Amino acid sequence: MEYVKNVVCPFCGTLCDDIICKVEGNEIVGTINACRIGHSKFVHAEGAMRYKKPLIRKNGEFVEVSYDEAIDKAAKILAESKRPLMYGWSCTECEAQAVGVELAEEAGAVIDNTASVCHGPSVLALQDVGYPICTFGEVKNRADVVVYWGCNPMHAHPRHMSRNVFARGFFRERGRSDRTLIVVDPRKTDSAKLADIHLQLDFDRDYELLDAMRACLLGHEILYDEVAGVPREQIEEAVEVLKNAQFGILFFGMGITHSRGKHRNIDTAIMMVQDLNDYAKWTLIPMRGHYNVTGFNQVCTWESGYPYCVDFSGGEPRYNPGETGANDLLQNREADAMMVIASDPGAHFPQRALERMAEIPVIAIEPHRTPTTEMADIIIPPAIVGMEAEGTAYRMEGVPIRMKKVVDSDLLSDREILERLLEKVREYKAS
């Protein structure tokens, strides 16, 4: 039994880098410090399918083939397509993501990540009004007001509150006792149960509440007696708590990206945070989902100039979320082929997008059996980043941390698979 310390967890955007892996004869058999989710990713569940070989769909049944045969057929599909969609990316490392961008340029494809079903509305908002953020250590060391707006970290980023709220920092040496914890959610979540203030507002009315808070912040009267189910007097009191902070942090999630208004809910929250700086030091951090969703948007931006929904059909990059996002291309029936990497749109896209996936060729670069592999024509299994392969990942507030190779696998990495696919697509485009 060996203990591998300082391991990076390949699950959520908290990107914990203090994991201890328990290793017995080339197998991760246990962990220390990782939460219930992180531990479940690291260890193998008895009976779960882990593909050992690539597969191709024949006539309802699948047949095992070599990497050469599977990559050859995947390359032929991408080469012959007029509007190929290359989607997912958030659960692989930055080098594999960079090969993806080069392959999307070669194929004249649209390249897009999970941001289009997640914090893509936050990206649209930050492009219009700004992005006032800080790193986790500034929250730990300075924050006296912590807000979780439309996120449930106890279920979705399980060690986030222990690392940022209960932690004793340089100027907040009493930890939890030095901070006012605020949670904004229509449900009484397990995260709201720990709050000092729970604003249990009406669903789909965050935009209306934020309009009232901003007007009040600027010295104006609130037009109505109740907004989003919160009385006028309590809105005024919440604003005073924010104005009296020495250092405030607004953490936010899917509760405002997926609900009515989408990007405009984030836009109004950002502008409130900016204007609060005339009274108190304020910043925000989007609760980025997958451990490397942030890395894709960083890589894609630095290489092309745009973060997601990037269309290379015309050679030069073009960007239009609502036209060039994965759900737009599938639901409007524009995409004629789809390559999925390190994502599960089969499980996580709406029914209208699945109807299109049933009619077009689907390539899945995936290690496990999922709803996407049930909808796939070609399955190519890789070595898993953070367990069997190394590479950079970016934390939710942009901190880059290198993922580790803890055990060995006979499978190819995502980067290796993508480099071979790029070479074969070039050969088919030429012939």
């Binding site: 004249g108 219009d128 935009y207 007007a215 037009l223 004629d336």
Partner: protein, 269 residues
Amino acid sequence: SEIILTPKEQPEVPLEAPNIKPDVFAGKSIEEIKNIQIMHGNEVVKLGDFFEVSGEPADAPEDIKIIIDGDVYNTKRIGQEMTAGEIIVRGNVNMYVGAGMKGGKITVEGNAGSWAGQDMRGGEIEILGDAGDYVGSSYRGDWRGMSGGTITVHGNADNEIGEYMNGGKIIIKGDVNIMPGIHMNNGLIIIEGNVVARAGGEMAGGTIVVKGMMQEFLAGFKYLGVEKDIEVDGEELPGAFYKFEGDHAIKGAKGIVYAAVGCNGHIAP
């Protein structure tokens, strides 16, 4: 002079045809018009591959009338950045119709996709059917949107019509969904039907008129009273209206929202 484009079967992978405009057709023969380049996904194709072409050429764009004699539901950017002349579409269009146009006129007899008249500078767009989201909007990240022109939609439209508007006029004869006039700086938006929510959200200036019912409104607005037989940029609107100034979530906001008294009693404080 009329130049007739009769569409062949529209492809499932959409076409992008910004070269379909009087400015490009001016000075070209019928045979040269058939060789105009358009995009079919990741391939460059000829206009003649997807349209039959006939009619009479002309040297100046102001003397050209393009008639698309059929449905072009899967053709994007028709009339993009046109300066003069006319386009009549006897059917539907996809996204970006008349995007960035400076003059002339486009008539769509059917429906239009999102971004109809995005970044418009002048001229006229008339959609006899419904329109999508972002009618007369700005582009992602830009704080400078539509600066002139008139857009009229005879049917319904969806979200964020006149997003970051900075001049011109938008008339929706039907209903809209949410956030019309979002971040509006200047211009006039008239909605003859209903609004679901958030009219004038984060507006700094300009005017929004709602003749139907606003189901929900915003607490950042100041109520100024009832005004009767109003006049806004020459448009005469008879009847009683509740008048609001805002959105006071924005610093120095001077925007005006008028809402018909008859169906907005629940919006007045």
